[PDB]
């Protein structure tokens, strides 16, 4: 499914709101400030992930490998670069109950690969 992003008008740079064209029976995205209209390409207007199945690997950034206060391990080598050392840490993010899961990051500079066991 995936989320749906906001899209803005091409004239007033205000957000385009959803609207339906009965004549063609087709979804349109129209600005309620100017008189711009656009043919939608997703057909989906709203998405709620109640389960919150978020891949926290996307929230991690490689720069965290520079943190002296994070633990490092030599037991989980990097699959992308083969570096031995890697920092690991827990989710520590709200809305995540099973947050004892460990996320690893490669400490090699300019690799910054992140993964999970």
């Amino acid at each position: 499914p995936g989320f749906v992003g906001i899209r803005f008008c091409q004239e007033c740079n205000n957000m385009l709101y959803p609207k339906e064209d009965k004549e063609n029976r087709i979804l349109l995205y129209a600005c309620r400030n100017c008189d711009y209209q656009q043919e939608a390409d997703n057909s989906c207007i709203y998405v709620n992930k109640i389960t919150h199945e978020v891949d926290e690997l996307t929230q991690i950034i490689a720069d965290v490998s520079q943190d002296p206060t994070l633990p490092r391990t030599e037991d989980h080598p990097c699959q992308k670069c083969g570096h031995k050392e890697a920092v690991f840490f827990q989710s520590h993010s709200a809305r995540a109950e099973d947050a004892m899961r460990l996320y690893y990051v490669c400490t090699a500079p300019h690799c910054g690969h992140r993964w999970t066991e």
């Binding site: 965290v64 002296p68 206060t69």
Partner: protein, 185 residues
């Protein structure tokens, strides 16, 4: 604004003043500057939050901080020559400020302690059968300095129940003695 995504914000005394592209070597430069008593004075706090890309610098008053021994790769910067010059403190006028100016000691505030990895003693910097950290950045001068004036009079306070140490810290203040030398006047 499109640049702010990957860039690191820089706050100075709470004001977002700009952004930067390599926060790591910026922090290295600023720490070198503060340890050399260059434009950055010793009491300036410089916190790099890494997960959120802020770098917060503080120069304002009221920030409680404490001195700590900086740590190299896994070694103290306080070599034996500093202790030697400190032993003859009364002849060669080698003082605490020379220790701070040498880049051997650093004042760390409460907010910069969050980004610091402390060694309780230099024994923690020894390579162990299983290394706990191996990437320390500072060391305690002595852990007993966590106590104040009245708790620093308790002998063996780590063998008492803590309420007892609190009650003594309160009762050292009602103890009789000589409150001041010039009490006759």
């Amino acid at each position: 604004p499109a640049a702010i995504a990957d860039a690191t914000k820089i706050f100075v005394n709470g004001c977002w003043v700009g952004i930067h592209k390599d926060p790591e070597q910026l922090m290295n430069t600023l720490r070198k500057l503060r340890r050399q008593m260059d434009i950055i004075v010793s009491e300036v706090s410089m916190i790099r939050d890494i997960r959120e890309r802020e770098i917060r610098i503080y120069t304002d008053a009221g920030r409680i901080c404490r001195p700590l021994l900086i740590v190299e790769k896994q070694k103290l910067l306080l070599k034996k020559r500093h202790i030697d010059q400190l032993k003859e403190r009364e002849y060669n006028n080698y003082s605490w400020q020379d220790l701070v100016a040498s880049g051997v000691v650093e004042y760390i505030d409460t907010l910069e302690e969050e980004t610091v990895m402390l060694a309780m003693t230099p024994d923690d910097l020894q390579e162990k059968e299983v290394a706990y950290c191996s990437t320390y950045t500072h060391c305690e001068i002595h852990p007993s300095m966590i106590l104040g004036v009245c708790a620093s009079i308790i002998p063996f306070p780590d063998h008492n129940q803590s309420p007892r140490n609190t009650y003594q810290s309160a009762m050292g203040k009602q103890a009789m003695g000589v409150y001041i030398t010039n009490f006759h006047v």
